[PDB]
Amino acid sequence: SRMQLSEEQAAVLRAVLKGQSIFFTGSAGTGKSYLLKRILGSLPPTGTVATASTGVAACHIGGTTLHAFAGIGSGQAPLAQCVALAQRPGVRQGWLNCQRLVIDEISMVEADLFDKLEAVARAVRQQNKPFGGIQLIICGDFLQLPPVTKGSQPPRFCFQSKSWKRCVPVTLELTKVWRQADQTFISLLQAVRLGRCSDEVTRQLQATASHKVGRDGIVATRLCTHQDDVALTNERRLQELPGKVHRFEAMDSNPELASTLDAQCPVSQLLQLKLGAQVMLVKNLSVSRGLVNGARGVVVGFEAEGRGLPQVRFLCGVTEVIHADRWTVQATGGQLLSRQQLPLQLAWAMSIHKSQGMTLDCVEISLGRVFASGQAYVALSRARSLQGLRVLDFDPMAVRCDPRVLHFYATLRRGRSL
């Protein structure tokens, strides 16, 4: 009972199916992610792999991080070390077989990584050809969130790679903001992508202080930039609770690798919950009842048997007793690692890093500061609801755009239709 595809959305699929290594791109909430799900529905599913930048925005479209797939850790070391690792039992085949590769949020891949892959691709598989032959279906938003700075100098976007133009000949554009309803909020947020604050932008978003966004016993609360802010916030907000502490330690195929799980995963070693605690759903469960990836709920009890499993009411409204599930990661080695743990993370505080790839309903964000170019746009363009959104301490030097990029979406603009 699925909805209609845009004439554009459709044309991408038509093009991908033929068998073209295409890339696609457009604003926050224009069905980049979703189109991938319907492409993954249409693609012969043997040797067809799916991936993303963030370990979360994969648990979202049911793949793994480009990292864990490729099996070369950080990609720091040279072309000869990197092909050592790809050659290893497990990874070797992972490669040989992939006929089709899909990557969401390409923004947070940094070109020297892309390049170091392309080479390794041609390497193990032995094709004398672009990316070892493999059909690249990519997407992301460049003006959204850019790659994590390794050292000090500026980190280097993916479109700036030398392989990039050689590996993804074609590029096409998505154009309508399906996410957000209200047409003011469409231009309001189309502005901030391009990096403009004239005073109605600034007035309206300032307006939202007096908004009270927090809904049914449940807040999709603050989007901080820094991760230690996030985890710390909650460590208080949960202490600030009368009930007793229910501990949930995991059960990993390897104990001593837990850290690799930790950072590639979406869950903690030790997750701790009391009554009334707020939480989020990190894997999909039942897309019918609507326990999807990114559910906002509140801990309404535990049972007194089993492992005392949590009970949760959600925003979508339906109530389910949560069991533990199982994640696996191709841990640079050719070992697959397991973890058994609840698919819940404490949903008071969430980094802007995590929130990219996702949609939201019920958000807060402080903007009395300056933020890394893009970092502003992202956290705003999460919310569906302009009414159920609250900005704090707004400041127009928050709104920053990298112009290397703006000129990338000018060079494309200036040889096209409108």
**28 known ligand binder:** yes
Nearest approach in angstroms of CB 144 to Mg ion is 9
SS (H, E, C) 377-408: HHHHCCECCCCCEEEECCCCCCCCCCHHHHCH
Nearest approach in angstroms of CB 61 to Mg ion is 8
**Nearer Cβ to ligand ALF (102/312):** 102
Which amino acid does the sequence have at 393?
Answer: D
**26 known ligand binder:** yes
DSSP result, 182-228: SHHHHHHHHHHHHT---HHHHHHHHHTTS-----SS----BEESSHH
Which amino acid does the sequence have at 382?
Answer: R
**Nearer Cβ to ligand ALF (32/384):** 32
**42 known ligand binder:** no
Q: Is 180 in the site for ligand ADP (CB under 6 A)?
A: no
Between CA 43 and CA 57 the distance in angstroms is 20
Q: Write each residue from 344 to 363 as x if it is in contact with ligand ADP (CB under 6 A), else as -, in one continuous string.
A: ---------------x----
Nearest approach in angstroms of CB 92 to ligand ALF is 31
Residues contacting ligand ADP: total by CB under 6 A:
14
Between CA 178 and CA 176 the distance in angstroms is 6
Q: Is 238 in the site for ligand ADP (CB under 6 A)?
A: no
Q: How far is CA 331 from the centre of its chain?
A: 20
Residues 6+ apart with CB under 8 A from 314: 218, 281, 290, 291, 295, 296, 297, 320
**32 known ligand binder:** yes
**Nearer Cβ to ligand ALF (31/310):** 31
Q: Which range, of 25-33, 48-56, 123-131, 261-269, touches ligand ADP by CB under 6 A? A: 25-33
* Residue found under tokens 């409108």: 418
Nearest approach in angstroms of CB 13 to ligand ALF is 17
Give me 358's structure tokens: 């996702």
A 10 A CB-CB count for 214 gives: 15
178 binds, among Mg ion, ligand ADP, ligand ALF, none (CB under 5 to 8 A by kind): ligand ADP
**Nearer Cβ to ligand ALF (33/208):** 33
Query: What is the rounded radius of gyration, in angstroms, for the C-alpha atoms of the chain?
Result: 22
List the one residue out of 95, 246, 89, 193 whose CA is nearest residue 405.
Answer: 193
Cβ atoms of 389 and 183 closer than 8 Å: no
Q: Is 293 in the site for ligand ADP (CB under 6 A)?
A: no
Nearest approach in angstroms of CB 40 to ligand ADP is 13
Which amino acid does the sequence have at 355?
Answer: S
Give me 204's structure tokens: 């309206």
Nearest approach in angstroms of CB 65 to ligand ADP is 16
**Nearer Cβ to ligand ALF (144/278):** 144
Q: Is 193 in the site for ligand ADP (CB under 6 A)?
A: no
The CA angle 244-246-248, to the nearest 5 degrees, is: 165
Q: Is 31 in the site for ligand ADP (CB under 6 A)?
A: yes
Instruction: Tell me which of 12, 29, 159, 218 binds ligand ADP, using CB under 6 A.
Output: 29
The CA angle 351-398-114, to the nearest 5 degrees, is: 55
Nearest approach in angstroms of CB 24 to ligand ALF is 11
**Nearer Cβ to ligand ALF (264/381):** 381
144 binds, among ligand ALF, Mg ion, ligand ADP, none (CB under 5 to 8 A by kind): ligand ALF
**Nearer Cβ to Mg ion (105/110):** 105
Residues that bind ligand ALF (CB under 6 A): 28-29, 32-33, 105, 141, 144, 356-358, 381
Beta strands in 262-362 (DSSP E): 270-273, 278-281, 295-302, 310-314, 319-321, 325-331, 335-341, 344-345, 350-351
| Annotated binding-site positions | 26-33
| Annotated binding-site positions for ATP | 26-33
